Amino acid sequence: DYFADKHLVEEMKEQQKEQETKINLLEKQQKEQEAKINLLEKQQATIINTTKKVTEVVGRVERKQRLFDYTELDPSQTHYFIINNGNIGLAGRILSIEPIDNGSVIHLDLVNLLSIPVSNLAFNMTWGTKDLPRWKQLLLNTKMDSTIELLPGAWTNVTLTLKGVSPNNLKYLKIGIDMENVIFDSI
């Protein structure tokens, strides 16, 4: 009763053997999983980096594409400017800004850069001061339809009435072209 049964210990040895095999398989599978995991990590880093690069490039391109959607300027510090939507090219020269009942009035000359006339252009305009959300809420906007005839190479007089802002506060202007009713001839 001080000592152990031989057969019981034999069974123990067999069990220890089976455990040995199991432990082996576990170690092996563990190495496999380690490899796969490392591979996954590195691939992920690569993806994140490449994505980073792509977003930067695409941001630059978007930024440059903005130039065809509209023209932004400070009418207090600009004489000549250009409006180009990829179809119609116009040049503008600001003659003067004058106060009129509640707001400002921009007198300017517009000129059709093309070889054929363009008529009945409409202008999308937003204006204000030189911030992000309220400065955007403090911007007024409108679409000016026109019957203006722009003959090729001819500086033509145009008046932009902008209510709500005095001349000395008028330091922001975003202007774009609406081509809904455009006719490529004399009106």
Q: Whats the size of the chain, residue-wise?
A: 187
Q: CB-wise, 3 or 137, nearer to a second copy?
A: 3
Half-sphere exposure of 119 (CA within 13 A, CB side): 9
* Binding residues vs a second copy (CB under 8 A): 1-6, 8-10, 12-13, 15-16, 19-20, 22-23, 26-27, 29-30, 33-34, 36-37, 40-41, 43-44, 47-48, 50-51, 54-55, 57-58, 60-62, 64-65, 67-69, 80, 82, 84, 86-87, 89, 91, 93, 111-116, 152-153, 155, 182-184
Q: CB-wise, 52 or 130, nearer to a second copy?
A: 52
3-state secondary structure of 59: helix
Residue 113: closest CA among 134, 132, 92, 139? 92
> Phi first, then psi: what are they for 3, rounded to 5°?
-120, 170
Q: CB-wise, 101 or 180, nearer to a second copy?
A: 180
